[PDB]
Amino acid sequence: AKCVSYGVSQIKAPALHSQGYTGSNVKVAVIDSGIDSSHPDLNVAGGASFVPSETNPFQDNNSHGTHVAGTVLAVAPSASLYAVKVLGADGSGQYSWIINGIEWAIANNMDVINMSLGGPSGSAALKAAVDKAVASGVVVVAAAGNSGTSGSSSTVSYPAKYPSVIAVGAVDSSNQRAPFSSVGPELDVMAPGVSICSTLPGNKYGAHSGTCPASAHVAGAAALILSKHPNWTNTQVRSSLENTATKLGDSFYYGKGLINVEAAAQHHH
């Protein structure tokens, strides 16, 4: 909203805005470090903390949750944000806390989960939680990871690496893969993730780079699509994003390409 960012244009969100679609009546769980709910540029509808040492989901001592929140609303100005705090100030959290956050999002009928986070290692418990959210009809979006490349090996973080999740990589303003953006066959789509200006705690603004801001754009895009097509299943929202992406190169690096929310929101299934 208040900090200008190229990313909103890049994914063609203004075309939805000009049609009157802004993500009205869409519940988006920001599963991250909290959201600074006292930021004048944010509104938070509810939330929960699962970080025993950081009990307030409506404060953010990391900054990532608040930056994600601002990007979600820049793309989908009318979206209802829920602050699901599973990470501490150092941007780390236990998988069990993450799972508790996912469980809360399912129980509270979230339309979209955004997981601005990933760990290097697998968990059947984490996989069961995202698979359950998808089975319950939630669109589950996650940052692909900031682990760069590892030759022919996947560097996609968990839970982005699970097939049920939409794994989002990062491009710059000229649609080139960001050097940090994780790669592999599990990568699904790309979005803007380089020098993204958004809300920071304490009524501040600033640029962040990562798959974290990239995932935020796709969570917002899912909210725009649901506002035009509130009857679409998560399966149909996901298909619309993947099948209408702008091809950018080899899928190992770029998945299906850059999301195009204008194209996605008029996809015929």
Author numbering: 1 to 75, 85 to 278
Quoted from the paper:
Omniligase-1 is a broadly applicable enzyme for peptide bond formation between an activated acyl donor peptide and a non-protected acyl acceptor peptide. The enzyme is derived from an earlier subtilisin variant called peptiligase by several rounds of protein engineering aimed at increasing synthetic yields and substrate range. Mutation A225N in the S1′ pocket and F189W of the S2′ pocket increased the synthesis to hydrolysis (S/H) ratio and overall coupling efficiency, whereas the I107V mutation was added to S4 pocket to increase the reaction rate. The final omniligase variants appeared to have a very broad substrate range, coupling more than 250 peptides in a 400-member library of acyl acceptors, as indicated by a high-throughput FRET assay.
Especially the Ptl variants with mutations M222G/L217F and M222P/L217H proved to have a much broader substrate scope and improved S/H ratio compared to the parent peptiligase. To examine the contribution of individual mutations on S/H ratio and substrate scope in peptide synthesis, we selected peptiligase variant M222P/L217H as a starting enzyme and introduced successive mutations. Inspection of the crystal contacts of Pre-1, Pre-2 and Pre-3 revealed that at position F189 (S2′ pocket) the enzymes in crystal form A as well as in crystal form B have close contact (3.7 Å) with Asn109 of a symmetry-related molecule. A Trp instead of a Phe at position 189 would be too close to this Asn (2.0 Å W189-CD1 to ND1 or OD1 of N109) which cannot adopt a different conformation because of steric hindrance. The different crystal forms show the flexibility of the active site of peptiligases. For instance, His217 is present in two distinct conformations, one pointing into the active site while in the other conformation the sidechain of His217 is facing the solvent. On the other hand, His217 introduced in Oml-1 can rotate away and become exposed to the solvent, enlarging the S1′ cavity and allowing slightly larger P1′ side chains to bind. In conclusion, the L217H + M222P mutations in Oml-1 increase the P1′ tolerance due to an enlarged S1′ cavity that arises when His217 rotates towards the solvent. The effect of all possible mutations on folding stability (ΔΔGfold) was modeled both using the Pre-2 X-ray structure, that carries an Ala at position 225, and the Pre-3 structure, which features Asn225. In an Ala225 template (Pre-2) clearly more strain was visible on both Val68 and Asn225 than when examining the Asn225 template (Pre-3).
